[PDB]
Amino acid sequence: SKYKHTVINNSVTLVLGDAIQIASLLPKCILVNAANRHLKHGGGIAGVINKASGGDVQEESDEYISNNGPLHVGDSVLLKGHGLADAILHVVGPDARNNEDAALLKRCYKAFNKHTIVVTPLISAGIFSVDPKVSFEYLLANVTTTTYVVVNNEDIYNTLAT
């Protein structure tokens, strides 16, 4: 403890708190960023990750994109951790505002499985406007590695913890 949490299965623990704070706690982990195709970290969790790095994350992201072009929806890229974690896995969830289908979360969450310990927000559950329950279902269905799923909204936590 130290945070409110529910163990869902052998792999997944749901945590009420801040993903950055949970990632700092763990000696070894990857932190997941809920990113857009251009890795422009203007807001949401992406914004808070970038600011916690003092803009180091945006700097790196720009270099990656500048040289490699935009990601596809459902793609991910493992980049440096900038002291927040061992590395940051930037994952591009579907944006329901752009009629992108929630089923692309399968690709997002499968990318977790090659990592030993993952700390993640619910992908697409913010401004990308996927039902948190739907995002969580896709996570449980596809994630097979040790994962701390961190939500900062107690009402969302209660819904998913039932």
Ligand SMILES: NC(=O)c1ccc[n+]([C@@H]2O[C@H](COP(=O)([O-])OP(=O)(O)OC[C@H]3O[C@@H](n4cnc5c(N)ncnc54)[C@H](O)[C@@H]3O)[C@@H](O)[C@H]2O)c1
């Ligand atoms: N031009 C641009 O900058 C541009 C354009 C289009 C889209 N977008 C991006 O789309 C992104 C992704 O949307 P999304 O829904 O996948 O992301 P998200 O940040 O919006 O939401 C993910 C979930 O995690 C929660 N959360 C937020 N901060 C948290 C924290 N500290 N710890 C744990 N949980 C936290 C949110 O409340 C939400 O439930 C935006 O953050 C933004 O970067 C940006």
